[PDB]
Every structure is written in structure tokens, then in C-alpha cells.
Amino acid sequence: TTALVCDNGSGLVKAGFAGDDAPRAVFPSIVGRPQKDSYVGDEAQSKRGILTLKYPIEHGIITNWDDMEKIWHHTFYNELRVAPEEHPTLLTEAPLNPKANREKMTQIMFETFNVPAMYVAIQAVLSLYASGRTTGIVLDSGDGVTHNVPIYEGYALPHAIMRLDLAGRDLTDYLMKILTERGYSFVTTAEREIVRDIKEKLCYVALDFENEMATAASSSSLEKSYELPDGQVITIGNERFRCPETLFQPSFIGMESAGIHETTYNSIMKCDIDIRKDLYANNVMSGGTTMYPGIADRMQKEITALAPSTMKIKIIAPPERKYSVWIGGSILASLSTFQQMWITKQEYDEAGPSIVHRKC
Ligand SMILES: CCC(=O)O[C@H](CCOCc1ccccc1)[C@@H](C)[C@H](O)[C@@H](C)CCC(=O)[C@H](C)[C@H](OC(C)=O)[C@H](C)CCN(C)C=O
Ligand SMILES: Nc1ncnc2c1ncn2[C@@H]1O[C@H](COP(=O)(O)OP(=O)(O)O)[C@@H](O)[C@H]1O
Ligand SMILES: [Ca+2]
């Protein structure tokens, strides 16, 4: 038998088998309900007109357990084709996921899917493992939420975790907006899926945002063309970098919040002076919203301006960081040493859902 790894994302569930290269299944974390009573994933948004879409894991934390039960059922069966009772299951959780939450995750796995063994891991922590580190600060930016998670000797430091409710979804919505100002009209849900493609293929982070704005304002050198599905060809200029600039200037979208460079900085400063140098030198970036070109070089710049002038700063941005969290779980669950760390069904029958407070 082989173990299972399920990354419960705010936008995309990444599912597969421990030991594997990448996730075997990647689909939207959406539950639709009005020839069935509930659809999950891709076909849930295809029939979005006849269904009511639910977002049970937005902002990282699971809010509806009936919806989430449907996603897990759709994952074991309709996506991975496995008997959950035959395979141990590793679930991921958001940073600062409360105790009452982990317990219900553990309860469902054993009572509703009857797994033989399970475990819950922090997503940021797994990403760091995937980069071959047990120490360093992770910037996880996904669909619905962004996190700074400093980690030392293999464990997250909850005290210094920063949560920023601004991510790829908000940038999609912003790009739709500034493209509609440009002269187009990207308003409908089907046009959101299109503007999301544009975002992922033509946007980048400007090293000097001030300079790029002025470059695009006096030359066509930063313009690209994008063909829409109906054949129409549109042109995108400064919108390419104004979109992900929002990560650094959340005021673009109307947030009083700080940029991802500041939350990274502020996160390190909450950590003990001894380990700060290790963190500065090990910024590992995780999640789809960190896939922009030149975002690493920008973090390299912005942190340097915030850190002590002597401080050695390195930004690690792995090419596979879109599945960094998943790959990490797949590595963790592949260790022999980790096998005793599973919560077994016997251990659950004897101590109940509160066993997860001593194992995870
Ligand atoms: C592609 C593989 C890879 O990236 O390698 C990583 C670093 C190791 O370097 C090479 C190596 C690997 C094995 C043997 C010798 C040398 C691995 C090993 C990671 O750092 C990671 C998977 C290790 C996990 C741990 O050591 C943590 C801290 C502990 O887990 C176990 C199995 O002992 C810890 C008890 C759990 C902490 N945790 C998950 C907190 O949330
Ligand atoms: N190459 C890319 N460039 C920019 N954004 C991307 C890219 N790939 C994925 N994304 C964005 O990342 C988000 C998905 O990230 P993910 O880490 O799966 O989120 P979560 O795991 O929190 O659900 C989506 O909003 C998507 O638009
Ligand atoms: Ca994620």
C-alpha cells in the first residue's frame, strides 16, 4: 500500500501519492449544488449557472465541514481512485489553524472515511522541507491568502507567523478591473477565467516599479498581445506589472495592509536575534502567486533596504514552487522515521480527536 497526500488549498486542492514527483490531481476547491446533488471541482464551475458555488477553504481555513466532506470524497474516489481505508492520508493545514479545526479534520478522516492512519501538517513547513531546509522563513502565497512562516530546526514559530488576506484571486480581480479601464470589458465569471490565464502568462514583478511605469508610458517595449478564445487580440501594457505590484503595495486594491516584503521583514524581527541571520539567508517562496517573473529579485531588493546593511540575504524561489507544499508532504511521508508519527486508527479509538494535539 502507498500513502496519500492531500493539500487542501483555498483555491486548488493538490492530491496524489507519497513518493511521487508531483500531485496526480489538481482541481478547484469548490462545491456546487442546485443529475446529482453535489458536484466538486472543475465540473462544479462548468455548471455554475445551475448550481450554488461554495468556497469552503477560502482564506486557508476550512469553514464548512459538509462542503469539505464532499471535496475529500471527490478526491479519494473521483480523482485518485483509492480506498481511503487502505491508504494512510496526509492532510495539509493553513498556518495558525486552530485546535478545534485540526480535531474535526482528524475526526472526519477516521469516522467518515475510515482511514487506517492520518496526519496533519502545516503547508509552509512542507514547502521548506521540499527545498531541503528545516530552517528558514517561508512566503506562501496561494489563491485566497498569503503567509509568512518562520521555521527553525524543522518547526514553525507560530508567534511570528504573518497572515495577509491578499493573494492570486485578489490579483485576478484587480487585473480584470484595470484592464476594463484600459478599454476592454472583463466582467463575467467566464471572463475571470480568461483574465486569470492572462495573469499567469504575461504578468511580472517590476524591480523598480516607478521606472517600469514610466517606461510603459513612453514606449511599446513592455506591451504584449494576448489572443482571446473568440480570436480577438488584445494588448496589455503596464497592467502586466501593476497587477502583482499589489503584493508590495496592497493600497492598489484598497488595503491598509503592508506589502509582502514588510510582512516578511516584520516576521523575522519577531524571531530571536540568534536565528534571524539564518532566516534572512533562507527566504523560501511557495505557492502559485509567487510564480511571477522577477519577484525574487524584487524581494532581494526590498528586504535589503529593510535589513541591516551587513545582513546576508538570499531568496530561494524553486521552479516547482507551485506544488512546493504538496511535494513536501510527499517527502515527509516517504521517510521511514515518519511512519511511527502517523496517528493510527487504534490510537484514535483510544484517545479520540484530541490525540492530534500530541502527534501533530
Ligand atoms: C527531497 C528531500 C529533501 O528535501 O531532503 C531534506 C533534507 C535532508 O538532506 C539530505 C538527507 C536526507 C536524508 C538522509 C541524509 C541526508 C528532507 C529530509 C527534509 O528536510 C524533511 C523531509 C525532513 C523532516 C524533519 O526532519 C522534521 C523536522 C521532523 O520529521 C521527522 C521525520 O523526523 C520532525 C519530527 C517533524 C516536524 N514537523 C513536521 C513540524 O511541523
Ligand atoms: N504562473 C503563475 N503566475 C501567476 N499566478 C499563478 C501562476 N500559477 C498559479 N497562479 C495563481 O496561484 C493561485 C493558486 O495558488 P495555490 O498555491 O494553489 O493556492 P492554494 O494552494 O492556497 O489554493 C491562483 O490564484 C492562480 O491564479
Ligand atoms: Ca497552498
Curated annotation (Swiss-Prot):
Top-rank taxon, per record: Eukaryota
GO molecular function: actin monomer binding; ATP binding; calcium ion binding; calcium-dependent protein binding; cytoskeletal motor activator activity; hydrolase activity; identical protein binding; magnesium ion binding
Subunit text: Polymerization of globular actin (G-actin) leads to a structural filament (F-actin) in the form of a two-stranded helix. Each actin can bind to 4 others. Interacts with alpha-actinin. Identified in a complex composed of ACTA1, COBL, GSN and TMSB4X. Interacts with TTID. Interacts (via its C-terminus) with USP25.
Family named by the database record: Belongs to the actin family.
Extra facts: In vertebrates 3 main groups of actin isoforms, alpha, beta and gamma have been identified. The alpha actins are found in muscle tissues and are a major constituent of the contractile apparatus. The beta and gamma actins coexist in most cell types as components of the cytoskeleton and as mediators of internal cell motility.
Job of this protein: Actins are highly conserved proteins that are involved in various types of cell motility and are ubiquitously expressed in all eukaryotic cells.
Chain positions found as ADP-ribosylarginine: R163
Record-listed Tele-methylhistidine modification sites: H59
Disulfide bridge map: none
GO cellular component: actin filament; actin filament bundle; cell body; cytoplasm; filamentous actin; filopodium; lamellipodium; skeletal muscle myofibril
Name of the gene: ACTA1
Places the protein is found: Cytoplasm, Cytoskeleton
Protein name (record): Actin, alpha skeletal muscle
Keyword terms, alphabetized: Acetylation, ADP-ribosylation, ATP-binding, Cytoplasm, Cytoskeleton, Hydrolase, Methylation, Muscle protein, Nucleotide-binding, Oxidation
EC number: 3.6.4.-
SMART domains, sorted: ACTIN
N6-methyllysine PTM sites in chain numbering: K70
InterPro entries: Actin, Actin/actin-like_CS, Actin_CS, ATPase_NBD
One GO term (biological process): skeletal muscle fiber development
Modification N6-malonyllysine, positions: K47
Signal peptide as annotated in the record: none
First-tier enzyme category under EC: hydrolase
Region feature (Interaction with alpha-actinin): 96-109, 344-356
PTM comment: MICAL1 and MICAL2 produce the (R)-S-oxide form. The (R)-S-oxide form is reverted by MSRB1 and MSRB2, which promotes actin repolymerization. Can be mono-ADP-ribosylated on Arg-163 by SpvB of Salmonella spp. This modification blocks subsequent polymerization and leads to cell death.
Main subcellular location of this protein, as a coarse class: cytoplasm
UniProt source species: Oryctolagus cuniculus
Reactions that this protein is recorded to catalyse: ATP + H2O = ADP + phosphate + H(+)
